Design an enzyme around this catalytic site. Structure first.
Site, PDB file in Angstrom:
ATOM      1  N   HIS A   1       0.806  -1.214   0.000  1.00 21.37           N
ATOM      2  CA  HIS A   1       0.000   0.000   0.000  1.00 21.37           C
ATOM      3  C   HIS A   1       0.843   1.269   0.000  1.00 21.37           C
ATOM      4  O   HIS A   1       0.267   2.336  -0.152  1.00 21.37           O
ATOM      5  CB  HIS A   1      -1.087   0.013   1.069  1.00 21.37           C
TER       6      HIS A   1
ATOM      7  N   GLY B   1       2.147   5.832   9.834  1.00 22.16           N
ATOM      8  CA  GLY B   1       3.572   5.846   9.517  1.00 22.16           C
ATOM      9  C   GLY B   1       4.303   4.619  10.046  1.00 22.16           C
ATOM     10  O   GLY B   1       5.446   4.380   9.669  1.00 22.16           O
TER      11      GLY B   1
ATOM     12  N   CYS C   1       3.426   1.462   9.413  1.00 16.38           N
ATOM     13  CA  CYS C   1       3.339   0.345   8.464  1.00 16.38           C
ATOM     14  C   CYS C   1       4.699  -0.055   7.962  1.00 16.38           C
ATOM     15  O   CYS C   1       5.565   0.807   7.796  1.00 16.38           O
ATOM     16  CB  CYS C   1       2.390   0.687   7.324  1.00 16.38           C
TER      17      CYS C   1
HETATM   18  O1  NEL Z   1      -3.879   1.522   8.698  1.00 19.72           O
HETATM   19  C1  NEL Z   1      -3.332   2.469   8.131  1.00 19.72           C
HETATM   20  C2  NEL Z   1      -3.189   2.538   6.624  1.00 19.72           C
HETATM   21  C3  NEL Z   1      -4.086   1.560   5.900  1.00 19.72           C
HETATM   22  C4  NEL Z   1      -5.464   1.735   5.855  1.00 19.72           C
HETATM   23  C5  NEL Z   1      -6.283   0.779   5.269  1.00 19.72           C
HETATM   24  C6  NEL Z   1      -5.731  -0.375   4.733  1.00 19.72           C
HETATM   25  C7  NEL Z   1      -4.359  -0.534   4.781  1.00 19.72           C
HETATM   26 CL1  NEL Z   1      -3.646  -2.018   4.210  1.00 19.72          CL
HETATM   27  C8  NEL Z   1      -3.536   0.424   5.326  1.00 19.72           C
HETATM   28  N1  NEL Z   1      -2.864   3.565   8.769  1.00 19.72           N
HETATM   29  C9  NEL Z   1      -2.905   3.843  10.158  1.00 19.72           C
HETATM   30  C10 NEL Z   1      -3.494   5.018  10.638  1.00 19.72           C
HETATM   31  C11 NEL Z   1      -3.538   5.283  11.999  1.00 19.72           C
HETATM   32  C12 NEL Z   1      -3.008   4.383  12.910  1.00 19.72           C
HETATM   33  C13 NEL Z   1      -2.418   3.218  12.436  1.00 19.72           C
HETATM   34  N2  NEL Z   1      -1.836   2.174  13.084  1.00 19.72           N
HETATM   35  N3  NEL Z   1      -1.382   1.228  12.209  1.00 19.72           N
HETATM   36  C14 NEL Z   1      -1.683   1.671  11.004  1.00 19.72           C
HETATM   37  C15 NEL Z   1      -2.345   2.922  11.061  1.00 19.72           C
END
Ligand code: NEL
Ligand code: NEL
Lengths: 304, 304
Positions: free
Chosen positions: B41, B143, B145
């Site tokens: 992603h 951030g 990920c």
């Molecule tokens: O989860 C995502 C990105 C994402 C969204 C939907 C699908 C995918 Cl595969 C990726 N961002 C985050 C934002 C806030 C806290 C977060 N903690 N861990 C991640 C995270």
């Protein structure tokens, strides 16, 4: 989101760990620049530990009696001196992995990471608090002496603790990196009173703010309190009295959540008086005091 | 003595962390040998995340669009490919800090350490379990990920998890290092059911053995039980059913304490039926399930 008992990344400290052997005893040492620091009790035998005469025991030792090994390589010891309860072994080679570092004496109620080591090899890392009574509740087996506690501010490691002893109660005692014990402890195999401990109020409040930020809000109530009223409750429940200095350090978390510090105090007051009623806060069924307000902000802002 | 939620020393993993930027998105990558692994992603924009067509989004990218930076030095990308939900960026330089490593797919109920990272820089390390429903309850902000989960057996790092997503419930989902999600999750911004979770029974039993080894014994009773009877209680309390395979893995702890596994099951049965009665076990007011039997033995034997 999510809140965990997070330790600092240990790599910078792993690069400083060595094994120190003197006679029959092996423990860990910290190699920074051309000095290896370790607990002075590396010079004792079991017969010595009831009340060692460290000055006399060290007079029987020469530089060549201190075997220092950094992984598989042997360090050459060119000097030794005792400073309080630590030995400083001057070596002929500066540690190439020496990070930017400081020696700091932490205050009770502050937190730090411990890199538990055996035979100069890192075993694991965990976060803990220095109790108000200057003990630590660690995870240390025989051979872990010389393991250190530290904090990291960007690229600088502030070393605050070196492990020396497990008291008969199973709690831990150690020194700053100048060899001064935290608390009243002495490096002898004797029963030693650790003071009355208390719960670190400002850290419990910081953790309740971490809980609100991370979605756990059930404990918020319609009440407020004063420092005086809250401190009567803190007294009853063996919590540290809250001061304006603690309220001030909670300012950033109060601003982030919009919950005034004294309103959070009223939530803590109700939790102390009523308990959790079989509920949890951030996966805990008790009031957690091992996160400072700085830890909560750091964890909730992603500081590297 | 003492028992803590201990993570593996993170140094070997810190040396593998890099920042990967593609277009406007930055996350973390893992640099092992001449390959950088990161969540696919990284190629999405916010408009893409409801249901990205990863194949089409990746076709619009060339090697030069993947900006990989290892601290302050830029890596040259000479190939890219998508494997399941990860991207593999071939670089022209092998990571000099590549430790001995393996990619493993862990089983639900197993534990691992997470090195939380932002912009390729390590922030902190914590230990956690893969829930029976394949989610993790981590501490991850935007951030994070690309941060990884791992275990270390002497000098070998077994990477088991790469962080991809925070579900709307605030729990975390990710993949093995071949990009296969743990659980039913997909890398899209949608509400996604995580299965019914359960408490990891064999880990709670391991932790009760850790408690006895470390001095907490109040919960030991005069009772015994059978697997059948215990499993009726496990059913009522949403605990995983205990099998002879779990009893066998608890053998070493049973031998160390002299407490038969089914007698420990009777202590757990009483704790489930009666609660803690305002008491604690190893500093916890709930039944802890994030320590495997291997973790308990490792922590209680000082493995490095
Ligand atoms: O989860 C995502 C990105 C994402 C969204 C939907 C699908 C995918 Cl595969 C990726 N961002 C985050 C934002 C806030 C806290 C977060 N903690 N861990 C991640 C995270
Ligand atoms: O505490 C000591 C050595 C010692 C005894 C008396 C005084 C001093 Cl300064 C040192 N050994 C240990 C044995 C078992 C578990 C342990 N955990 N941490 C240490 C430790």
């Amino acid at each position: 989101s999510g809140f965990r008992k997070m330790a600092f990344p240990s790599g910078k400290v792993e690069g400083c760990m060595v094994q120190v052997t003197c006679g029959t005893t092996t423990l860990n040492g910290l190699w920074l620049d051309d000095v290896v620091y370790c607990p002075r009790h590396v010079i004792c035998t079991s017969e010595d530990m009831l009340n060692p005469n460290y000055e006399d025991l060290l007079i029987r030792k020469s530089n060549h009696n201190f075997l220092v090994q950094a992984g598989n390589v042997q360090l050459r010891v060119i000097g030794h001196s005792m400073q309080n309860c630590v030995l400083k072994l001057k070596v002929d080679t500066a540690n190439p992995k020496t990070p930017k570092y400081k020696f700091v004496r932490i205050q009770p109620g502050q937190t730090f990471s411990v890199l538990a080591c055996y035979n100069g090899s890192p075993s694991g890392v965990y976060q803990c608090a220095m109790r108000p009574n200057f003990t630590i509740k660690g995870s240390f087996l025989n051979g872990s002496c010389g393991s250190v506690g530290f904090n990291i501010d960007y690229d600088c490691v502030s070393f605050c603790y070196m492990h020396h002893m497990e008291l008969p109660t199973g709690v831990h005692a150690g020194t700053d990196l100048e060899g001064n014990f935290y608390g009243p402890f002495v490096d002898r195999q004797t029963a030693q009173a650790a003071g009355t401990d208390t719960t670190i109020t400002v850290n419990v409040l910081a953790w309740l703010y971490a809980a609100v930020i991370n979605g756990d809000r059930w404990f918020l109530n319609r009440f407020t309190t004063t420092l005086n009223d809250f401190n009567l409750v803190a007294m009853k429940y063996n919590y540290e009295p809250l001061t304006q200095d603690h309220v001030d350090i909670l300012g950033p978390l109060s601003a982030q959540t919009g919950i005034a510090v004294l309103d959070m105090c009223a939530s803590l007051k109700e939790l102390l008086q009523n308990g959790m009623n079989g509920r949890t806060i951030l996966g805990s069924a008790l009031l957690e005091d091992e996160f400072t307000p700085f830890d909560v902000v750091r964890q909730c802002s992603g500081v590297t």
